[PDB]
Amino acid sequence: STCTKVLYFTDRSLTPFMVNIPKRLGEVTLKDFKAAIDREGNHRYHFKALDPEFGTVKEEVFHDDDAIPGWEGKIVAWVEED
Amino acid sequence: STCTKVLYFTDRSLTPFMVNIPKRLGEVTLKDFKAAIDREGNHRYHFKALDPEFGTVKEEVFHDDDAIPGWEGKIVAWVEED
Amino acid sequence: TCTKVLYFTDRSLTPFMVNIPKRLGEVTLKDFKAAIDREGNHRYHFKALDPEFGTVKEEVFHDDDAIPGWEGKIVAWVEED
Amino acid sequence: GSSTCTKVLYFTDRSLTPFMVNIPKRLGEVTLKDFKAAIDREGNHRYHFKALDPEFGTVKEEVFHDDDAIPGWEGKIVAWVEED
Amino acid sequence: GSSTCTKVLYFTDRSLTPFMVNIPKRLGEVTLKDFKAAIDREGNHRYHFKALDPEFGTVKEEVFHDDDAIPGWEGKIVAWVEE
Amino acid sequence: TCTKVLYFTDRSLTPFMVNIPKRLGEVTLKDFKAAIDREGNHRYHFKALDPEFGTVKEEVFHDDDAIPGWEGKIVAWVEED
Amino acid sequence: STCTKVLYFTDRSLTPFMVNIPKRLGEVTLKDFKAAIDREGNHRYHFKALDPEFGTVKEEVFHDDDAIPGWEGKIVAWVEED
Cα–Cα distances (Å) from D81 to B58, D10, D47, D73, in that order, read: 32, 7, 5, 16
Measured distance CA(A30)–CA(A36) in Å, rounded: 9
A60: Cβ contacts below 8 Å, ≥ 6 apart: A44, A45, A46, A47
CA distance D12 to chain G (A): 12
Cβ proximity of C76 and C7 under 8 Å:
yes
Q: Which stretches of chain G sit within 8 Å of chain E by CB?
A: 9, 11, 14, 16, 46, 58, 78, 80
Nearest-CA distance C7 → chain E (Å): 10
Distance CA C12, CA D80 (A): 8
Sign of CA dihedral A9, A11, A13, A15: positive
With residue D39 as reference, give the H or E element that holds it.
Answer: helix D32-39
Calculate the CA A47 to chain-centre distance: 5
With a CB cutoff of 8 Å and minimum separation 6, the contacts of F46 are: F57, F58, F59, F60, F67, F68, F70, F74, F75, F76, F77
Q: Which residues pair with C28 in a beta bridge?
A: C66
Nearest-CB residue to G54 (from D9, D22, D40): D9
CA separation for the pair B77, B8 (Å, rounded): 4
CATH of the domain at B9: 2.40.240.130
Q: Is D67 exposed, middle or buried (0-12, 13-18, 19+ CB in 10 A)?
A: exposed
Q: How far is CA B41 from CA B34, B38, B44, C14, in A?
A: 9, 7, 10, 15
Contact residues for E6 (Cβ-Cβ < 8 A; gap 6+): E22, E23, E25, E26, E27, E30, E72, E75, E76, E77
SS3 E33: helix
**Regarding beta strands B55-60 and B74-81, do their DSSP bridges make them parallel or antiparallel, or are they unpaired?**
unpaired
How many residue pairs bridge chain C and chain E with CB atoms within 8 Å of each other?
26
How does E53-72 read in b/e, with b if 16+ C-beta sit within 10 Å?
A: eeebebbbbbbeeeebebbb
Subunits with 3+ C-beta pairs closer than 8 A to F: D, E, G
How long is chain G?
A: 82
Q: Give CB contacts under 8 A, 24+ apart, made by G65-68.
A: G65/G29, G65/G30, G65/G31, G66/G29, G66/G30, G67/G26, G67/G27, G67/G28, G67/G29, G67/G30, G68/G25, G68/G28, G68/G29, G68/G30, G68/G32, G68/G33
Give F18's contacts (C-beta < 8 A, 6+ positions apart).
F5, F7, F35, F36
Q: Quick check: F43 and F29 in contact, CB under 8 A? A: no
The answer to whether residues B45 and B33 touch, using CB atoms and an 8 Å cutoff, is: yes
CB count within 10 Å of CB F74 equals: 23
For E34, which DSSP code? Answer: H
Contacts of A13 in chain B (CB under 8 A): 9, 11, 14, 78
- Which residue range forms the structural domain that includes residue B31? 1-82
Give the H or E element holding residue E62: strand E57-62
Mutation for C interface: A2, A9, A14, A18, most C CBs within 10 A:
A18
Q: What are F35-43's contacts with CB under 8 Å, separation 24+?
A: F35/F5, F36/F7, F36/F78, F40/F80, F41/F80, F41/F81, F42/F78, F42/F79, F42/F80, F42/F81, F43/E40, F43/F78, F43/F79, F43/F80, F43/F81
The strand pair at G13-21 and F44-50 is best described as unpaired
Three-state SS sequence of B8-63? EEECCEEEEEEEEECCCCCCCEHHHHHHHHCCCCCEEEEEEEEECCCEEEEEECCC
d(CA B64, CA B33): 9
Residue E18: half-sphere exposure toward Cβ, Cα within 13 Å: 21
Question: Which residues in F10-51 belong to E strands, given as ranges?
Answer: 12-20, 44-50
D14, closest residue in chain F (CA to CA):
F53
Secondary structure (3-state) at A37 = helix
Q: What is the DSSP letter of C51?
A: T
Q: Is the dihedral of CA G18, G20, G21, G24 positive or negative?
A: positive
Question: At A3, which amino acid appears?
Answer: C
Interface B-D: count of C-beta contacts within 8 A: 27
CB atoms within 10 A of CB A10: 18
Q: Is residue A23 classed as helix, strand or coil in its secondary structure?
A: coil
Number of domains chain B contains: 1
Technique used to solve these coordinates:
X-ray
Q: What are phi and psi of A37, to 5 degrees?
A: -95, -5
Contacts of G49 in chain D (CB under 8 A): 20
Taking an 8 Å cut-off on Cβ atoms, the answer to whether E60 and C17 are in contact is yes
Cis ω before G41 (30° cut-off from 0): yes
Contact at CB, E61 and C17, closer than 8 angstroms: yes
Q: Which residues contact E38 (CB under 8 A, 6 or more apart)?
A: E8, E21, E23
Nearest CA of chain A to the CA of C14: how many Å? 20
Euclidean distance between CA atoms A9 and A76, whole angstroms: 8
Q: What resolution, expressed in A, was reported for this entry?
A: 3.0
Question: Quick check: do A and G touch, 3+ CB pairs under 8 A?
Answer: no
Query: How do E15-23 and F54-59 pair as beta strands?
Result: parallel
Dihedral sign, Cα of residue G61, residue G66, residue G69, residue G73: positive
